[PDB]
Amino acid sequence: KPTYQVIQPINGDPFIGSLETPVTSSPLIAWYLSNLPAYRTAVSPLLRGIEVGLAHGYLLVGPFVKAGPLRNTEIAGQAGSLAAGGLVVILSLCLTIYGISSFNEGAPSTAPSLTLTGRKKEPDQLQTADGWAKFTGGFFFGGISGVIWAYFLLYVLDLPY
Amino acid sequence: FGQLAIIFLWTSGNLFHVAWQGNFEAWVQDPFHVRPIAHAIWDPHFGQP
Amino acid sequence: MSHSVKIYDTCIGCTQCVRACPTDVLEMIPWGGCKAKQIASAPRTEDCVGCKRCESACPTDFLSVRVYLWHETTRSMGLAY
Amino acid sequence: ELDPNTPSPIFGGSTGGLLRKAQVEEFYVITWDSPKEQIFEMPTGGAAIMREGPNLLKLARKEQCLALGTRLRSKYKIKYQFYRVFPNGEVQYLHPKDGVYPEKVNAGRQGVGQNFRSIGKNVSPIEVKFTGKQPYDL
Amino acid sequence: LVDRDPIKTSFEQWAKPGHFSRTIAKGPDTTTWIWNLHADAHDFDSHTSDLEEISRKVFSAHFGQLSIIFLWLSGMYFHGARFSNYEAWLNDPTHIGPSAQVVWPIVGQEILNGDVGGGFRGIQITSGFFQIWRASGITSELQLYCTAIGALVFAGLMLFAGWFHYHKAAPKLAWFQDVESMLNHHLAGLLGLGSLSWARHQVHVSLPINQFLNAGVDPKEIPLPHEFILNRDLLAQLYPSFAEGATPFFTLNWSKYADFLTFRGGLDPLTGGLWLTDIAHHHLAIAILFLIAGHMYRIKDILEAHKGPFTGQGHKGLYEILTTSWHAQLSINLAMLGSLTIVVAQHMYSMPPYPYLATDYATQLSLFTHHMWIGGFLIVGAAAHAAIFMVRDYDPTTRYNDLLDRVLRHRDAIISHLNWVCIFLGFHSFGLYIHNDTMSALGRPQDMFSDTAIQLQPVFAQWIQNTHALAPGTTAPGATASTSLTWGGGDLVAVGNKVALLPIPLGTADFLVHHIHAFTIHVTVLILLKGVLFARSSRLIPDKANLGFRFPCDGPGRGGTCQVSAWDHVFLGLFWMYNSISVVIFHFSWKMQSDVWGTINDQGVVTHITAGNFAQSSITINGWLRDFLWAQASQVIQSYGSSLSAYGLFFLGAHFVWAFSLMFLFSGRGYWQELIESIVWAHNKLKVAPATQPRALSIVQGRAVGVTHYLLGGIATTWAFFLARIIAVG
Ligand code: CLA
């Protein structure tokens, strides 16, 4: 009922701010994002890696196969993996040497669940390095790979119009 | 002493992007204000033009 | 040095003279008289940033003061954050 | 944050005030006396009404509490406190310590002032080029 | 102060050493204060705590200006009468190339003054009276010499009303701080009773006296001087004595008429102004509104009303203040006055409102760039003065908790966005061009962005322009063509040397300039917006409003702590806008000549001053000095020994003054001190200096002498560059 929730700016204290509002926090947005890392960690990553790798994968095709350097290609290759498959490699390790910001190094192991987590204090890290690996390892097999059922597909395609 | 050092990796290549290509054996033959060469440009960006 | 910009003077009296500055300065130490006899260049300075609001008012009668620590904190920066 | 509201001091929301590295370093909350409820300027673009107390709002960085302070003594009162919080409680305890109101004596603390020599003629350069025999490290 | 207060000196103070801020100018001597005081001659922190007068001063200063325009332009209208050019031109227009102004021949001077004319030596003019002017029908040189003194009448009097305020014992609070009417009046009967009154002297007299001028004669072969009342036979032509209507209304019959009016649309042929006859109707149809409109009303009433959930409580009593801020009710205004001037700058060039413009090229682009720098020079201002609000004006806090207090609530936010906006632009809004170079210099056009190469394919045509002319599907009735001739549909046919006006069709290469404007308009505003918003307190300084909107910079600490403030956001925001406008100008003339400005020739084969070189060649940003700066400008650096020459001969100075600014812009301050003493020393040896302690420039004065010079430098450079490539071919 309350003019917008029991009317609060933030979670409650005003003072951090973020002026929590729609597009910050509406039952409708907020939800379109929790198997995914925004709030909770669904599973120990390893898997999120490829839905991340892959979805972002078959992107970067018409960007560099329809806007390519000398464009609209007559080659077997593009439509194409090509260079883009090269980008997921540069990308994916530009990605790794960031997982040298956190190492923090363990196996604990839980994608299995005890007791509704809370994480407890997930906010902030508590991702060890042996986590950020299995993500940016999922990234490679998500990038390269997610680059082929892009071109594998014939483009049945829609014409400008 | 890390100097002198870098002045010769400069000079070496100055004499070595010469003499498989970019004349002498035409520029000595006798050299009239046309365009004797240092080196070969190689960029993938280039057109045919 | 790690904050070393000399504002010292000679009166170090602080009435209709100078106070301005975010935390850094507790002074009023006295030294065994100078007329008003609150003296010194400083209190302990590992707390705040680098103004020269430090003179702007009440004499230093040689150098102004200024940026110079070099050796620089974040809290002493303003930004980390 | 509902399950405990301790609050004394009254904004509503802002974009302003502290973002994450107040948790990961050093915390910095200021507290105060009040009479009858008044409407105030802030740090961070503005403003609120006070009432009473603890009257203990928390700020980002120390420049900001003191900054009211000027703020807080025009329109007056004696009493303003500012403390520094960690994560993990204490050391560095900021306004509490002896007296307050710098411009008093009990004691010295601090400061010197001179280093080794006084203001007069350092036309004289810096001297020996850093060796660990001679008193150049304070 | 006390020379001697209150009651008991008439006797004026001239002398004993004089005034400001309380440790007033010392007694003991300095230089800076002579620079202070021209600056910040009015700020209004000082003179009085209490607004009291000042509103009682700003009415007087206003009077002075109104006079002054008047002193001006009597001058102008003089000049315009008795150094005539005008009588001669008007029989003669489209031959003439017109002056008001002549030198005298002393020393060099007179290269300058080169035959303009109906047979006299001149300096050619590009502001047009001679076109405001066409309107007067009656004519002759000695009058304008009456309109002239009629000018000096309004002045002396509209300048003794300024005696007749402040200095005279004079007025008090209520009179402004009860507003309640003020727009009521203003818009009703002046906004109205001018445009209204202007109607009455815009068909009465002007219409007829160019209705049969648009043929020739030697004037007065046409128009008697008073001629035009009880009389009128002459109205009969140009229409009826209403013959039998009554006070409009209807039980009226036309089998053939409808009252003068009869709307025009398009341009006159053989005077392509646009019809001198929609000009009455439109002004008439204005005034009414204003006539009805300025009849609101007395206030919070409307403002205190509607609220929303995002929307602002503040909206209400959105300002008891407003009545007495001032600095705010000027800042708002400048944005409008200012932003309502450069909307002139379009409707002008794509819809001339004076007889003989377009054909007259140079005498309406000068315009479109003068009017253009005001719809900009007045906008950055319109921010400065808000910053002047945002810091100071009210004694105390009691604005409270609104809409503003709202906007600020977010502020590292409204400006958090706007930022990325710009780097999105810039990358899509300039490196776009740089592609071309890097790849047309690499050279492979297949893949440029050329209007031909990257595919849209050869139409611009349909967006709005094509719906706009094409206009009468409509509830629209009217008039054979357009509101503006340029819009795509319609016409070959406009004018007699020359082309005046034609479609302008764009495509791409109108596409992306149009976008650089975006990014240029946007990062301009970022700096002013964030500037005026973070006016008073900031995450870097809280103790930030405390002297100043000005202060130099807080101090070496916090890392930088220099620019900050908001004099300086209104210092680096000018710096941009100088581009904002400086590149919009660069846009229009390269278009308007590459296409449009014309010639007609047998069978109308259009010959644009440049056969559309624009085509494939603005897109390259070198083409912008291949085709622009190095192409045109050849007329600036050829201009010696001529008549205009004063442009080529300026174009070096002021193309010097600019390259002097950097010295003021790029330098320290205790530097010119450290220097100013070596000087001061040499001075004392001979015994020649100390008194009035010579001092270097006041940190921010130095910035004041940047900027200001960087502009009157970098600007008149083109004022020269221009008048030098429309005078002479084009
Ligand atoms: C309708 C509004 C108009 C009015 C009435 C005012 C009024 C005011 N403005 Mg202001 N301002 C305006 C438009 C206006 N402004 C615009 C459009 C801008 C943007 C540029 C500004 C930017 C501005 C700033 C930054 C400041 C003010 C300030 C002020 C206040 C100080 C006035 C003063 O001392 O004169 C100042 C005039 C001079 C000292 C004369 C010097 C002029 C030089 C630069 C010459 C200009 C170049 C020209 C080509 C030279 C002549 C030709 C030569 C080569 C022969 C005053 C209340 C000042 C303040 O502190 O507020 C209290 C502050 O300085 N204004």
Ligand code: CLA
């Ligand atoms: C004939 C008379 C005259 C005299 C003797 C005075 C005398 C005085 N006036 Mg004053 N005043 C006058 C006519 C006069 N006024 C007129 C006609 C107006 C309205 C137009 C005003 C509006 C006015 C105001 C608002 C104020 C005064 C104030 C004052 C006092 C300060 C004067 C001063 O030093 O300013 C020196 C300035 C001048 C002598 C020149 C005035 C500027 C205008 C009118 C013309 C100059 C513009 C000109 C084109 C320059 C720019 C171009 C340049 C490149 C050449 C002083 C007692 C002030 C006061 O009460 O003390 C705080 C107050 O601020 N007057």
Ligand code: CLA
């Ligand atoms: C003092 C300095 C020295 C000198 C003599 C110059 C001189 C010049 N620099 Mg320069 N410069 C210097 C140091 C110097 N610079 C330094 C250290 C730098 C930084 C590295 C620069 C960076 C620089 C740049 C980027 C530019 C220049 C340019 C220029 C030239 C402008 C063209 C010109 O003046 O035509 C000479 C002819 C005249 C001046 C005719 C004058 C006739 C008119 C003005 C009327 C008579 C005068 C009258 C009083 C004016 C009316 C005012 C009235 C209202 C009182 C000029 C030759 C500009 C240029 O043109 O190309 C590079 C360019 O913008 N300089």
Ligand SMILES: CC1=C(/C=C/C(C)=C/C=C/C(C)=C/C=C/C=C(C)/C=C/C=C(C)/C=C/C2=C(C)CCCC2(C)C)C(C)(C)CCC1
């Ligand atoms: C009581 C009476 C009356 C009254 C009368 C009068 C007094 C009137 C008037 C009239 C009027 C009162 C008019 C006015 C007009 C105005 C106008 C018309 C405006 C203007 C202006 C201008 C022209 C400007 C311009 C510009 C611009 C644009 C901006 C800036 C620049 C310049 C300035 C250029 C009557 C009649 C009923 C009668 C009975 C009695």
Ligand SMILES: CC1=C(/C=C/C(C)=C/C=C\C(C)=C\C=C\C=C(C)/C=C/C=C(C)/C=C/C2=C(C)CCCC2(C)C)C(C)(C)CCC1
């Ligand atoms: C030896 C000597 C000298 C020197 C001289 C010289 C060397 C000079 C120069 C100069 C230069 C080398 C430059 C300058 C320039 C200036 C200027 C330039 C001024 C002004 C201006 C104006 C008037 C403007 C106007 C405008 C406007 C309106 C706005 C914008 C545009 C324009 C700019 C157009 C003398 C004799 C002095 C002194 C003695 C010694």
Ligand SMILES: CCCCCCCCCCCCO[C@H]1O[C@H](CO)[C@@H](O[C@H]2O[C@H](CO)[C@@H](O)[C@H](O)[C@H]2O)[C@H](O)[C@H]1O
């Ligand atoms: C500049 C690149 C060309 C691309 C646009 C071309 C499409 C339209 C055709 C030409 C446009 C110019 O329009 C022009 O047409 C004719 C030139 O042949 C001229 O035709 C004019 O001259 C003659 C005199 O009676 C007659 O043929 C016409 O009745 C008359 O309109 C006109 O001066 C002008 O109306």
Ligand SMILES: CC1=C(C/C=C(\C)CCC[C@H](C)CCC[C@@H](C)CCCC(C)C)C(=O)c2ccccc2C1=O
């Ligand atoms: C060059 C420069 C100076 C030096 C500039 C000076 C000292 C200009 C002032 C010179 C004045 C205008 C000379 C005035 C003397 C004459 C008016 C006196 C005789 C009167 C006549 C009849 C000639 C600064 O002070 C400065 C300050 C801050 C940032 C940058 C700079 C900067 O770049």
Ligand code: SF4
């Ligand atoms: S500022 Fe200088 S004079 Fe003033 S109290 Fe401090 S040391 Fe003394």
Ligand code: SF4
């Ligand atoms: S600005 Fe300077 S004097 Fe002031 S507190 Fe900081 S360091 Fe100390």
